[PDB]
């Protein structure tokens, strides 16, 4: 799709990279473990 030219500039919005981070599908990610360790240390659900 980039060979066609769906430019990574114009596709990417603030709301888009919210949705790309916030997605809970696809393969495994250790995000759940680590970001809960982030908010536990930063803001001591």
């Amino acid at each position: 799709l980039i060979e066609n030219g769906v430019s990574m500039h114009r596709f990417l919005t603030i709301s888009r990279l919210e949705e790309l981070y916030n997605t809970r599908h696809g393969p495994s990610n250790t995000l759940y473990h680590l970001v809960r360790d982030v908010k536990k240390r930063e803001y001591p659900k």
Binding site: N4, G5, S7, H9
Partner: protein, 53 residues
Amino acid sequence: RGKICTIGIAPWGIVENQEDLIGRDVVRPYQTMSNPMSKLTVLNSMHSHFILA
């Protein structure tokens, strides 16, 4: 391996998306898409210089 000097000589009155083609000595953003609606045709991506006029 080469980097070949492949200067094309075009018109300005034919380059597609002339409104997207406005600005002065800036590294300017070109969506390389060719919309088939406008009969104006894009520059070739694989050439290296352009003399649109």
